Amino acid sequence: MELSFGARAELPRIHPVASKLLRLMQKKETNLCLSADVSLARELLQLADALGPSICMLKTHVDILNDFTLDVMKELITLAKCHEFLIFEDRKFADIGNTVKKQYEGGIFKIASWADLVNAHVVPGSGVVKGLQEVGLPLHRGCLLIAEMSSTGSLATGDYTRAAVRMAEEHSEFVVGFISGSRVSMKPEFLHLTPGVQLEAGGDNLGQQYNSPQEVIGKRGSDIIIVGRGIISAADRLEAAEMYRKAAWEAYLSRLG
Amino acid sequence: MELSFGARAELPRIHPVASKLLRLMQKKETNLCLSADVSLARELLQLADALGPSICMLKTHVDILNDFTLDVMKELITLAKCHEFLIFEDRKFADIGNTVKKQYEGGIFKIASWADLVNAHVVPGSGVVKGLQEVGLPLHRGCLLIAEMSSTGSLATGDYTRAAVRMAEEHSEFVVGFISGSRVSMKPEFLHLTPGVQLEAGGDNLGQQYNSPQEVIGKRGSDIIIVGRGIISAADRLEAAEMYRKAAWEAYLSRLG
Numbered sequence: 001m002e003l004s005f006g007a008r009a010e011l012p013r014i015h016p017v018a019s020k021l022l023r024l025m026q027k028k029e030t031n032l033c034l035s036a037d038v039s040l041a042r043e044l045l046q047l048a049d050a051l052g053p054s055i056c057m058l059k060t061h062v063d064i065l066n067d068f069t070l071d072v073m074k075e076l077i078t079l080a081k082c083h084e085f086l087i088f089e090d091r092k093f094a095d096i097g098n099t100v101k102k103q104y105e106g107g108i109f110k111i112a113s114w115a116d117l118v119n120a121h122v123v124p125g126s127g128v129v130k131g132l133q134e135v136g137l138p139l140h141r142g143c144l145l146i147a148e149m150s151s152t153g154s155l156a157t158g159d160y161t162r163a164a165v166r167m168a169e170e171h172s173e174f175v176v177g178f179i180s181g182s183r184v185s186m187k188p189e190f191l192h193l194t195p196g197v198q199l200e201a202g203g204d205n206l207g208q209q210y211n212s213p214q215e216v217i218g219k220r221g222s223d224i225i226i227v228g229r230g231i232i233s234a235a236d237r238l239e240a241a242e243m244y245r246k247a248a249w250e251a252y253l254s255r256l257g
Numbered sequence: 258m259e260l261s262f263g264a265r266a267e268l269p270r271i272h273p274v275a276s277k278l279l280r281l282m283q284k285k286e287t288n289l290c291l292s293a294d295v296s297l298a299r300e301l302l303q304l305a306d307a308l309g310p311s312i313c314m315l316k317t318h319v320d321i322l323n324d325f326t327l328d329v330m331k332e333l334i335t336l337a338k339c340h341e342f343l344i345f346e347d348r349k350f351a352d353i354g355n356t357v358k359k360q361y362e363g364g365i366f367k368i369a370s371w372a373d374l375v376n377a378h379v380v381p382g383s384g385v386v387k388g389l390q391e392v393g394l395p396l397h398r399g400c401l402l403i404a405e406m407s408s409t410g411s412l413a414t415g416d417y418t419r420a421a422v423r424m425a426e427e428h429s430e431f432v433v434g435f436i437s438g439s440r441v442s443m444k445p446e447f448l449h450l451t452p453g454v455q456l457e458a459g460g461d462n463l464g465q466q467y468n469s470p471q472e473v474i475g476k477r478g479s480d481i482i483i484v485g486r487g488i489i490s491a492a493d494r495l496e497a498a499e500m501y502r503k504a505a506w507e508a509y510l511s512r513l514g
């Protein structure tokens with residue numbers, strides 16, 4: 001029983017953040033997350049504004065913005081609200097709960113104040129999620145757990161991936177899904193977001209491996225494609241994003257019937 | 258069979274950063290790394306100045322500083338040079354090489370400009386090291402790989418730990434050791450730093466587990482203890498740091514003979 005994004009948004013155990021995401025994916029016909037790996041706030045905001053209508057999510061690495069300020073993130077929130085997409089900071093929290101709680105709430109980035117979604121590696125055990133969730137629950141935030149990775153030599157396989165799935169299931173009041181290369185949970189309440197995506201076959205020179213939208217959404221059963229250089233390196237980033245959106249969207253439609 | 262810190266600093270394959278660290282550990286009779294998990298730059302610099310004589314290393318989480326600026330790291334360097342300790346930013350790089358390279362050099366933190374040491378998780382595969390190396394080698398830096406973690410439910414065990422050791426030994430131009438709970442490499446050129454250390458048994462309420470300096474250095478074979486709250490929460494932080502220094506140092510001496 002493969003359900004549309006809109007119906008999954010109505011599932012009994014759905015987290016509010018995931019429901020909001022799934023509703024806008026259905027409304028806008030996009031399951032594309034732009035990975036805005038840029039070093040200038042001006043470029044980040046110009047990309048968010050021009051590509052907002054094409055994306056369900058904008059993934060940030062605020063630690064590579066040379067001119068980060070909280071005012072930049074306020075402007076980004078305004079665009080996310082205007083164009084209707086979630087903001088996902090790819091922070092990869094990956095330490096004991098006492099530390100990650102401080103990294104999520106505090107410091108100069110104050111990630112919890114502007115990020116709808118964050119992610120975490122599961123290697124430290126569930127305390128990483130327990131620490132994050134203390135901050136995220138009053139703020140109605142959600143978290144994605146990295147169950148699989150797209151890079152060569154990834155150790156996020158086998159029992160490690162199963163441990164991520166179990167951890168997500170155990171913390172479903174905060175964890176809304178996974179970073180993975182394929183469907184890893186059979187529960188339709190969880191989102192699957194897949195990086196390592198490009199239209200053409202290949203990789204990079206530092207261990208990144210790419211698969212196509214049709215492969216990851218259609219055959220591997222993921223929900224959302226995360227695309228950075230496949231868009232950001234094009235001259236016309238809008239046309240590139242539209243190519244990726246149509247690819248991922250039609251791949252999703254094909255598995256409904 | 259076991260070599261003093263001073264003799265390890267002279268080994269043919271020793272990395273310069275490890276050598277520099279080992280030499281100052283011997284000179285100052287300290288194998289204590291202070292974990293300065295604080296929210297204010299003022300507190301970071303006051304602790305570095307007051308406790309610098311007692312430590313071989315100061316471990317930072319710059320992303321928890323509410324008022325981070327590069328001028329704070331310039332002042333920290335001056336203290337590190339004066340008191341002779343290394344600066345270890347506990348960044349936990351943990352993604353594909355192309356991303357971590359930018360995170361290490363760029364953004365607001367400019368970590369490579371001031372951190373003698375950083376660490377990385379090995380879950381992405383060796384690309385995480387290859388990316389960091391492109392920034393750290395020109396800047397004469399070292400990196401620690403997280404082979405084991407101190408937290409309940411850690412997945413950094415078994416084959417994962419072995420994969421970390423192999424990764425380190427194959428990138429010895431840049432990787433100088435590990436975050437681990439024990440000796441994980443038999444090569445004396447590599448340093449073992451162990452967090453989760455307190456004098457008394459216990460843990461915290463978010464999955465941290467503690468072992469004593471004598472257990473970690475003496476029976477488990479590690480080189481350096483990383484201590485945060487055990488010192489920072491003490492009324493007399495200098496006396497606490499001295500207690501941890503003497504404990505770890507004597508356990509190291511005992512192991513030698």
Ligand SMILES: Cc1cn([C@@H]2O[C@H](COP(=O)(O)O)[C@@H](O)[C@H]2O)c(=O)[nH]c1=O
Pocket residue numbers: 035037061090146148149150151179195196197208226227228229230352353356
């Ligand atoms: C957890 C995870 C994250 N990213 C992130 O996804 C984006 C992929 O970008 P690109 O499409 O340019 O390779 C980058 O921001 C990267 O750090 C991956 O590529 N793979 C992963 O397994």
Ligand SMILES: Cc1cn([C@@H]2O[C@H](COP(=O)(O)O)[C@@H](O)[C@H]2O)c(=O)[nH]c1=O
Pocket residue numbers: 095096099292294318347403405406407408436452453454465483484485486487
């Ligand atoms: C990789 C790793 C890091 N830290 C860090 O070591 C310090 C431990 O501090 P405390 O002594 O306050 O528990 C913290 O900064 C924490 O994030 C651990 O505790 N355990 C780990 O496995």
